[PDB]
């Protein structure tokens, strides 16, 4: 052992006493009961170092003797070392931050809470709901799976996090009411803030490493992400660009971790081209961070010109500012945000030389691999390179190559060598496969569409998400919001598309029966910002599926805004992407919590919005679609041979667009269908809407009619 | 300062909004066609020697728009759910009217134009045009000696006219005195600027609205002898502390 790896595992297990107290195995306080769990475990399999980490649950008289009892020489550590390791890991538990049955209260809605289940994207969608007292039986079956895994885990931080995350994710760090923090997040945030103080040199302080600025909040944001993925010259290439921006991200994050002697626990989040890192305030660190920033900007300039940038700013920070007084955390993130917005306005300022087929094989080989190896640049089978290291693809049969192995879409290290740092990454990579093993193309997606052969393109966004993240008091709160947020897109969107959570979602606007292998292709999902393409009607339905599940998955306390477009299969990507992007921030602009559903004529009186409130559109599809649309591309038998009506209504509605105060439209509709009993809601003058200065029901019909007509051609 | 604004009343729909590097490029080609090199060398020397043209910007009736100076972006915070939304729509805003532009220079409170008089239709067969609202065209500014406007620019603009027509007027912009300035042309900088957005064309320009400390810009001559306009159109701007 070294003092570095010991303190990391220290902070990481300080509070593994909590899952065993509530199971009732060793009937002491969690401090005591967590020590008997590890010392117990050490004895079994006979791994001496667990008995050394057992001290972290517990006038220092007995402690120095209980450490002296244990051979610090047997490992490579001093006694006066392990005393700092304990006080550091003690203080960090303060910095990170009742009944033995209270469940985890959802960060989205602290009024709801998660049913005790373990993290599995395949099985079910976590929905904050009704508080169920957690049995001591359940904790005992958890602790037994926890026991068996830590038995086989290789006692590096990299193998330990994946089992702590698997099991202790849906568990209240503290069992008071309205407690937001997941156990695993509070564990990793201490394992981070502890390791930070160690490298910061400071020791035997009991408030030097608390009121002195011995921390760095690091934040890297990519700018030009869309300019780099879109704006090309095909679909295979476009996902290939998304994937590749993921690897460049890790390669800079992993380098910063490597070169500061930190661990993956120090990565607060890393998704949507945004990463945050907690680290030391030593002069060596700031030197190393400028070196990494500098070398990484240049590599980005030579390979992509100014197309894609990386703004890495950091702020020095005291322990105080890791939580609440008088909010200091969200205040200090706010001064880092500022530093970033200036740097993004100084693109490649870090380059004074400024003012004077692999990705084709990364789109074709895509459906057989488990991850990538992070070796040197000059290495055999290196498929693509980042700003620091070469990435060799890792095939099912293949042998993992490199210092770090990025594994995709498992927390289970599987068959890789003991000496390989394990870095799990998830990504919403759903795609329709063709009769050829390759992913579906824009014509293939456009051809499986009900009625008119157009390609659906949908672009989404989580509403006021920067506000939400800025509301978190503590790193452990922020860790949980970010982790759960990212997991909805990277974990659950894969499922929603397959058809899972049919109950929780329910009735949504749809034109065909959901397919078993949906004609959808995720381009880039992940935290907040997603972009999906496929058969236009499947993309139209997916839009509401994603919005419902997201409403469920959250407290119904967070909203989407989605921009939808249906284009000709032979449309250039940047143009399609340019349009929905425009339709999307129309949705955000007309208040939020809305979907832009189709192109729409409207009076420009500043009173008529193009987007729909989601429930408003959902209520409209319920009312009108069943009266005119038979399902699966056919029209209601009654209108079959009276279809011309639906155009004559659209024609009628247009005479309302011309003058919204003229009543003539209600004259006309009554003659037009005089069967009469269809569309009662539009023949009359709504005086409620005249009061509320809202539009007339006629103004909204197009958003349902035009879709039906698209599906019946 | 006070400027002569060459208004391009559009007899038909445009293909682009022409920034200063291509306005100058067309003015040069027109002078080459009418007069030839002898004048182009004196057209360059007039610019090197002090004269400037801004990029092209939208107008609407008696409303002239200008590029939002990037100096306002870091100073925005200078309600919770009212600060988020508007502050993003200010960060998104590309153009301001002259009133709000003159306020933006002095980091005073200012509002955004709700309606923009041009619209990027992309017609399929595909390319795109720009459809101008009524009495709505594009202008660009010219600072420098009168003898050189009557001489070189006005005849070149008239000659270029013969897709649009050309009228022009005086035009004042109240800009505070400052060490820092906003370019109203895309520029090729000589110092490293203050705040900026890069612009790729092959040359890296600094965008209309970037911030400079006494950077004249500069022109570049090359053989394919054609000159490329990268001069600054500087207007006094106030900065926050940052
Ligand atoms: Ni504790």
């Amino acid at each position: 052992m070294e003092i570095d790896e010991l303190t990391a595992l220290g902070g990481l297990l300080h509070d593994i006493g909590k899952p065993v107290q509530r199971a009732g195995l060793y009937s002491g306080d969690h401090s005591t009961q967590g020590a008997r769990f590890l010392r117990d475990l050490a004895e079994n399999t006979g791994r001496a170092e667990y008995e050394l980490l057992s001290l972290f649950s517990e006038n220092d008289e007995l402690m120095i003797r209980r450490i002296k009892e244990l051979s610090p020489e047997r490992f490579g550590l001093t006694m006066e070392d392990v005393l700092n390791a304990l006080w550091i890991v003690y203080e960090a538990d303060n910095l990170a931050s009742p009944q033995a049955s209270r469940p985890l209260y959802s960060v989205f809605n602290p009024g709801k809470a998660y049913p005790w289940a373990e993290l599995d994207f395949e099985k079910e969608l976590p929905v904050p709901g009704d508080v169920f007292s957690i049995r001591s039986q359940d904790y005992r079956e958890l602790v037994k799976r926890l026991w068996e895994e830590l038995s086989k885990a290789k006692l590096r931080s990299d193998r330990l996090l994946p089992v702590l995350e698997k099991y202790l994710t849906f568990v209240s760090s503290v069992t008071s009411e309205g407690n937001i923090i997941s156990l695993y997040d509070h564990m990793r945030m201490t394992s981070a803030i502890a390791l930070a103080m160690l490298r910061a040199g400071c020791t035997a302080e009991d408030g030097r490493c608390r009121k002195e600025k011995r921390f760095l909040l690091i934040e890297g944001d990519f700018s030009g992400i869309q300019d780099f993925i879109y704006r090309v010259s095909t679909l295979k290439y476009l996902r290939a660009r998304s994937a590749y921006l993921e690897l460049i991200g890790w390669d800079v994050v992993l380098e910063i971790l490597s070169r500061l002697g930190l661990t993956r626990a120090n990565v607060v989040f890393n998704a949507g081209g945004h990463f945050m890192i907690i680290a030391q305030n030593t002069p060596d660190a700031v030197k190393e961070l400028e070196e990494i920033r500098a070398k990484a900007v240049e590599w980005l300039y030579r390979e992509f010109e100014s197309d894609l940038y990386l703004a890495i700013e950091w702020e020095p920070v005291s322990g105080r500012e890791f939580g609440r007084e008088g909010n200091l955390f969200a205040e200090a993130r706010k001064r880092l945000k500022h530093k970033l917005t200036v740097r993004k306005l100084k693109r490649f300022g870090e380059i004074k030389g400024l003012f004077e087929n692999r990705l084709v094989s990364l789109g074709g080989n895509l459906p057989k691999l488990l991850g990538f190896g992070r070796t040197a640049k000059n290495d055999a089978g290196v498929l693509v390179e980042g700003p620091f290291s070469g990435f060799v693809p890792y095939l099912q049969g293949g042998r993992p190559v490199g210092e770090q192995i990025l594994v995709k879409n498992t927390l289970n290290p599987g068959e890789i060598p003991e000496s390989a740092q394990f870095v799990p990454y998830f990504v919403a990579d759903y795609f329709k496969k063709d009769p050829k093993g390759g992913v579906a193309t824009f014509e293939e997606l456009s051809m499986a569409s009900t009625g008119t052969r157009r390609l659906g393109v949908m672009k989404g966004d989580v509403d006021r998400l920067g506000e939400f993240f800025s509301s978190m008091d503590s790193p452990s709160k922020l860790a949980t919001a970010s982790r759960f947020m990212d997991y909805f897109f990277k974990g659950y969107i894969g499922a929603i598309i397959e058809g899972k959570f049919g109950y929780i979602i329910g009735d949504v606007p749809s034109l065909r029966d959901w397919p078993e292998e949906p004609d959808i292709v995720v381009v880039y999902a992940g935290g907040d910002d997603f972009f999906i393409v496929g058969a236009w009607d499947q993309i139209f339905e997916l839009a509401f599926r994603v919005r419902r599940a997201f409403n469920a998955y959250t407290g119904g306390k967070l909203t989407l805004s989605v921009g939808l477009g249906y284009f000709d299969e032979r449309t250039p990507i940047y143009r399609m992407a340019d349009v929905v992007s425009e339709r999307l921030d129309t949705a955000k602009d007309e208040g939020r919590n809305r979907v832009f559903v189709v192109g729409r004529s409207r009076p420009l009186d500043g009173k008529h919005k193009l987007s729909y409130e989601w429930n408003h559109y959902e209520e409209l599809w319920r009312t009108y679609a069943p009266r005119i649309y038979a399902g699966n591309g056919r029209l209601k038998g009654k209108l079959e041979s009276k279809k011309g009506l639906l155009w004559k209504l659209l024609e009628i509605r247009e005479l309302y667009v011309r003058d919204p105060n003229d009543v003539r439209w209600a004259y006309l509709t009554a003659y037009l269908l005089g069967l009469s009993d269809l569309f009662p809601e539009l023949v009359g003058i709504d005086t409620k809407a005249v009061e509320r200065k809202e539009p007339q029901p006629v103004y909204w019909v197009d958003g349902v009619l035009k879709i039906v007509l698209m599906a019946v051609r | 300062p006070k400027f002569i604004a060459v208004k391009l009343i559009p007899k038909g729909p445009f293909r682009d909004i022409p920034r200063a590097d291509t306005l100058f490029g067309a003015i040069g080609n027109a002078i080459s066609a009418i007069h030839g090199q002898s004048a182009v060398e004196e057209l360059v020397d007039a610019f090197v020697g002090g004269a400037r043209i801004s990029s092209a910007f939208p107008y609407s009736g008696d409303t002239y728009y200008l590029p939002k100076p990037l100096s306002v972006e870091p100073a925005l915070e200078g309600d919770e759910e009212e600060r988020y939304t508007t502050a993003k729509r200010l960060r998104k805003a590309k153009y301001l009217d002259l009133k709000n532009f003159e306020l933006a220079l002095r980091l005073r409170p200012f509002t955004i134009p709700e309606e923009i008089p041009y619209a990027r239709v992309d017609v399929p067969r595909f390319w795109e045009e720009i459809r101008f609202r009524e009495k709505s065209g594009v202008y660009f500014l010219y600072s420098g000696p009168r003898e050189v406007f009557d001489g070189y620019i006005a005849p070149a603009m008239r000659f270029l006219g013969d897709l649009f027509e050309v009228e022009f007027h005086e035009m004042k912009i109240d800009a505070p005195g400052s060490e820092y300035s906003v370019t109203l042309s895309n520029a090729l900088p000589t110092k490293t600027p203050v705040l900026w957005r890069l612009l790729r064309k092959r040359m890296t320009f600094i965008a209309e609205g970037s911030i400079v400390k006494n950077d004249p810009g500069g022109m570049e001559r090359l053989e394919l002898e054609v000159y490329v306009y990268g001069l600054t159109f500087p207007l006094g701007v106030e900065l926050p502390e940052g």
Side-chain angles (χ1 to χ4, degrees):
Chain A
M1 280 303 283
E2 293 198 26
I3 73 168
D4 39 279
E5 283 186 6
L6 178 75
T7 37
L9 306 176
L12 209 43
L13 302 166
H14 181 296
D15 307 64
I16 198 185
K18 301 188 172 164
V20 289
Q21 151 162 65
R22 310 201 272 260
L25 282 171
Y26 303 164
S27 78
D29 83 335
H30 86 275
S31 300
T32 287
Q33 196 149 347
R36 255 207 295 290
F37 182 71
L38 290 185
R39 183 215 317 160
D40 202 276
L41 175 50
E43 287 178 40
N44 203 341
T45 324
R47 304 306 151 195
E49 304 91 334
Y50 268 134
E51 193 169 49
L52 185 54
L53 296 166
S54 59
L55 294 149
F56 282 103
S57 321
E58 288 167 18
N59 292 354
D60 283 356
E61 310 162 36
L62 284 76
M63 291 291 302
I64 295 173
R65 297 189 286 185
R66 287 167 183 189
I67 298 158
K68 198 174 176 175
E69 198 274 280
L70 287 156
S71 43
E73 322 92 25
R74 152 173 57 166
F75 298 128
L77 310 168
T78 311
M79 198 278 307
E80 301 154 49
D81 272 344
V82 180
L83 297 179
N84 304 317
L86 292 161
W87 280 144
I88 286 174
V89 161
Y90 169 74
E91 171 78 287
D93 191 80
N94 233 303
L95 299 184
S97 145
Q99 292 196 356
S101 62
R102 297 271 199 71
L104 165 64
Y105 288 93
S106 170
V107 51
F108 309 131
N109 204 13
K112 311 211 167 198
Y114 296 98
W116 165 230
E118 82 176 32
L119 200 155
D120 202 338
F121 299 150
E122 297 191 332
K123 253 186 167 284
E124 216 53 11
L125 173 72
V127 184
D130 350 22
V131 174
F132 286 149
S133 66
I134 309 171
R135 311 169 117 180
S136 55
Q137 294 175 309
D138 295 321
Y139 271 99
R140 290 177 67 205
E141 171 57 48
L142 162 69
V143 162
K144 284 173 186 185
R145 303 167 75 75
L146 189 46
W147 172 270
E148 289 162 85
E149 296 296 320
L150 304 174
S151 287
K152 314 192 158 157
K154 298 288 168 193
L155 262 163
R156 284 173 185 179
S157 319
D158 51 84
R159 309 301 172 119
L160 201 65
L161 282 162
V163 311
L164 289 180
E165 198 185 22
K166 247 191 161 206
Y167 295 102
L168 311 186
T169 182
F170 280 119
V171 181
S172 203
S173 76
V174 47
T175 64
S176 55
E177 277 208 43
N179 180 63
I180 286 157
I181 304 168
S182 157
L183 181 60
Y184 166 82
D185 299 315
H186 179 88
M187 298 200 299
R188 64 183 252 244
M189 291 314 300
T190 48
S191 173
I193 299 166
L195 176 41
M197 300 164 100
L198 189 79
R199 300 279 191 219
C202 77
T203 167
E205 320 291 8
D206 45 62
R208 194 100 49 252
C209 325
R210 178 152 210 294
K211 312 192 182 181
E212 220 162 58
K213 289 164 177 174
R214 301 225 183 197
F215 300 98
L216 273 189
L217 290 177
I218 305 169
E219 192 153 338
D221 184 46
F222 284 87
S223 76
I225 298 165
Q226 35 206 352
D227 294 328
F228 169 76
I229 300 177
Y230 316 131
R231 324 230 200 284
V232 152
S233 318
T234 38
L235 198 32
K236 287 183 186 177
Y237 192 73
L238 213 158
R239 42 146 49 67
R241 304 304 290 290
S242 190
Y244 177 37
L245 166 68
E246 286 289 304
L247 296 182
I248 286 155
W250 283 116
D251 190 34
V252 177
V253 173
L254 286 176
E255 184 69 8
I256 301 166
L257 290 186
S258 156
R259 279 201 205 171
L260 290 195
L262 296 172
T263 180
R264 176 158 61 76
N266 292 84
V267 187
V268 182
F269 55 81
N270 179 63
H274 217 150
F275 69 77
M276 183 190 299
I277 293 170
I278 300 184
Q280 53 271 33
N281 203 137
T282 85
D284 288 315
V286 305
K287 190 172 299 191
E288 282 289 328
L289 281 173
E290 291 156 341
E291 276 202 63
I292 290 170
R293 183 221 265 147
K295 189 175 168 192
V297 165
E298 286 145 36
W299 180 90
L300 270 174
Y301 188 91
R302 307 176 173 204
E303 184 67 45
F304 302 118
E305 313 177 320
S306 167
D307 272 31
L308 182 70
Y309 183 54
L310 195 56
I312 301 178
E313 283 283 312
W314 50 78
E315 204 183 16
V317 159
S318 79
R320 299 164 164 176
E321 306 182 85
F322 274 135
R324 197 105 151 171
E325 285 191 21
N327 202 342
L328 287 174
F329 191 35
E331 259 292 79
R333 280 163 40 62
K334 189 158 203 179
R335 300 188 300 265
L336 181 53
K337 190 74 207 78
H338 184 254
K339 292 203 212 297
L340 283 167
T341 75
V342 176
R343 165 74 53 206
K344 297 193 232 175
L345 287 167
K346 287 162 102 73
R347 297 189 71 168
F348 301 99
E350 303 105 330
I351 290 167
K352 207 170 289 169
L354 177 56
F355 308 126
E356 290 177 13
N357 300 325
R358 307 303 186 78
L359 300 88
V360 172
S361 39
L362 188 71
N365 306 15
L366 203 54
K368 297 161 218 191
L369 95 167
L370 314 177
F372 294 84
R374 204 185 91 118
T375 54
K377 296 197 134 173
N378 173 53
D379 184 297
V382 155
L383 187 45
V384 297
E385 308 203 356
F388 291 101
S389 52
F391 291 91
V392 184
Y394 164 43
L395 307 179
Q396 183 71 65
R399 269 192 210 162
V401 195
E403 294 149 329
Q404 308 86 351
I405 314 300
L406 278 149
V407 186
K408 182 178 73 174
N409 276 17
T410 40
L411 285 176
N412 302 327
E415 286 166 30
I416 72 170
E418 284 198 347
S419 44
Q421 275 187 36
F422 169 77
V423 189
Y425 77 102
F426 308 91
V427 53
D429 68 295
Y430 187 93
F431 65 83
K432 181 70 189 289
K433 314 193 176 187
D434 268 355
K436 329 205 162 180
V439 316
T441 93
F442 283 123
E443 194 186 12
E444 309 274 354
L445 292 176
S446 197
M447 285 207 253
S449 76
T450 310
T452 66
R453 290 163 199 175
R454 303 259 196 83
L455 178 91
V457 175
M458 101 166 164
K459 189 201 169 91
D461 193 50
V462 167
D463 286 330
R464 292 175 174 161
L465 180 73
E467 170 164 9
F468 177 63
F469 282 146
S470 186
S471 80
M472 310 315 285
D473 274 349
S474 72
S476 324
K477 281 190 182 183
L478 177 57
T480 308
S482 51
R483 196 169 61 96
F484 286 160
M485 180 76 270
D486 191 21
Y487 279 170
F488 176 75
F489 297 113
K490 278 185 185 180
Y492 284 110
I493 279 197
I496 300 172
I497 296 164
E498 294 180 65
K500 294 205 185 149
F501 320 146
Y503 168 72
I504 290 84
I505 285 166
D507 280 75
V508 313
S510 85
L511 294 154
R512 66 182 311 267
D513 289 282
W514 201 240
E516 200 146 14
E517 285 189 344
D519 297 82
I520 308 293
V521 165
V522 180
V523 152
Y524 83 89
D528 90 75
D529 182 8
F530 58 104
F531 188 73
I532 316 261
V533 304
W536 75 263
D537 42 297
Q538 288 188 33
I539 283 291
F540 167 82
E541 183 177 343
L542 184 63
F544 296 99
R545 286 187 169 272
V546 172
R547 178 261 165 176
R548 277 224 202 281
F550 181 81
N551 186 80
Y553 181 93
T554 53
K557 265 294 195 308
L558 285 178
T559 69
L560 297 185
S561 299
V562 168
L564 285 156
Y566 321 103
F567 312 87
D568 171 283
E569 52 193 55
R570 317 182 297 273
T571 315
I573 41 168
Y574 70 96
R575 182 240 163 180
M576 286 164 141
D578 229 49
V579 152
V580 289
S581 266
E582 167 182 329
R583 290 184 164 183
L584 171 52
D585 46 21
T586 311
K588 297 207 278 205
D589 256 353
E590 315 200 308
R592 273 156 174 87
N593 195 11
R594 329 169 72 74
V595 53
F596 200 115
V597 173
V598 66
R600 283 224 298 156
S601 77
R602 82 168 155 160
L604 301 167
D605 61 346
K607 310 308 307 149
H608 300 65
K609 295 172 172 192
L610 294 156
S611 46
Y612 294 76
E613 295 179 347
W614 286 100
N615 299 309
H616 186 31
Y617 189 82
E618 275 168 34
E619 279 155 11
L620 276 168
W621 185 271
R622 273 157 200 151
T623 293
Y624 290 120
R627 305 216 221 112
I628 64 176
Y629 191 76
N632 289 344
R634 310 304 183 285
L635 212 65
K636 271 304 191 181
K638 315 306 219 155
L639 300 174
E640 191 173 349
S641 73
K642 294 187 187 172
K643 155 170 177 185
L645 295 167
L646 311 186
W647 287 104
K648 284 168 203 177
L649 277 178
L650 278 171
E651 285 293 342
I652 291 160
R653 187 196 89 97
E654 278 284 354
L655 303 186
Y656 167 96
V657 181
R658 312 246 199 272
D659 187 17
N661 293 22
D662 188 350
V663 200
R664 53 178 169 179
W665 55 272
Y667 161 108
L668 169 88
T669 64
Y671 300 119
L672 201 281
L673 37 74
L675 295 175
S676 298
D677 298 3
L678 210 66
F679 304 110
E681 325 287 1
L682 321 178
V683 308
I685 310 143
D686 184 329
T687 76
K688 195 168 231 158
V690 176
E691 301 175 2
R692 309 177 162 287
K693 286 288 304 178
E694 292 183 319
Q696 295 287 305
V698 169
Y699 170 68
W700 301 111
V701 158
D702 49 347
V704 178
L705 281 199
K706 293 163 68 165
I707 295 286
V708 170
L709 283 182
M710 283 165 57
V712 183
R713 206 158 298 155
Chain B
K2 64 191 207 170
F3 299 117
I4 287 153
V6 176
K7 282 178 65 115
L8 280 53
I9 304 109
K11 189 90 183 168
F14 287 6
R15 339 181 170 197
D16 67 308
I17 311 204
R19 51 218 327 146
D21 80 282
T22 74
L23 271 168
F24 183 79
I27 292 175
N29 299 3
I31 294 292
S32 208
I34 308 166
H35 286 67
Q37 275 188 33
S38 51
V40 175
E41 294 282 316
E42 286 172 313
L43 176 59
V44 159
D45 272 350
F47 278 21
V48 178
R52 297 294 197 269
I53 57 154
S54 82
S55 287
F57 313 117
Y59 74 69
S60 195
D62 317 322
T63 316
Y64 303 141
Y65 291 54
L66 272 156
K68 154 218 191 63
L70 294 191
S71 74
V72 308
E73 291 226 39
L76 283 161
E77 300 173 4
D79 180 16
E80 270 186 313
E81 298 200 73
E82 274 297 338
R83 268 176 196 166
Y84 290 115
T85 67
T86 56
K88 270 201 173 56
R89 315 324 289 200
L90 302 159
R91 174 176 315 282
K92 276 167 193 177
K94 197 157 192 180
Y95 304 89
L96 297 164
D97 82 280
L98 176 62
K99 193 152 68 74
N100 286 275
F101 175 84
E102 291 178 330
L103 286 161
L105 301 177
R106 282 169 236 268
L107 302 191
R108 293 205 210 161
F110 68 83
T111 68
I112 304 305
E114 281 237 59
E115 305 196 339
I116 296 90
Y118 90 74
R120 275 189 191 180
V121 177
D122 42 283
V123 176
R125 292 175 164 181
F126 57 83
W127 291 68
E128 63 208 42
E129 287 160 43
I130 294 171
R131 303 268 218 285
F132 284 84
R133 194 154 178 166
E134 299 200 353
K135 292 182 169 178
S136 325
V138 164
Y139 74 112
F140 73 85
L141 303 159
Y142 166 90
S143 86
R146 180 75 205 190
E147 56 213 311
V148 169
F149 179 75
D150 283 342
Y152 301 79
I153 281 73
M157 272 313 300
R158 289 172 187 182
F159 180 93
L160 283 157
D162 271 330
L163 300 186
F164 55 83
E165 292 145 24
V166 186
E167 89 190 11
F168 34 81
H169 320 82
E170 222 188 8
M171 207 205 76
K172 277 189 182 164
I173 309 173
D174 210 24
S178 168
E179 301 188 359
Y180 304 104
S181 30
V182 205
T183 55
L184 298 189
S185 50
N186 59 306
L188 313 163
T190 67
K191 336 200 97 172
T192 71
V194 177
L195 309 170
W196 73 90
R197 298 186 335 270
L198 288 174
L199 200 79
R200 186 73 185 177
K201 282 203 168 187
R202 289 198 168 280
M203 314 290 308
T204 52
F205 287 80
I206 272 194
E208 42 155 44
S210 313
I211 311 298
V212 293
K213 208 184 87 172
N214 187 39
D215 198 344
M219 298 216 53
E220 273 171 39
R221 156 162 41 75
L222 50 92
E223 257 199 291
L224 299 168
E225 308 228 4
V226 59
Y227 296 79
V228 157
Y229 180 95
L231 297 177
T232 61
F233 197 98
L235 282 195
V237 70
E238 282 175 5
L239 290 180
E241 291 142 30

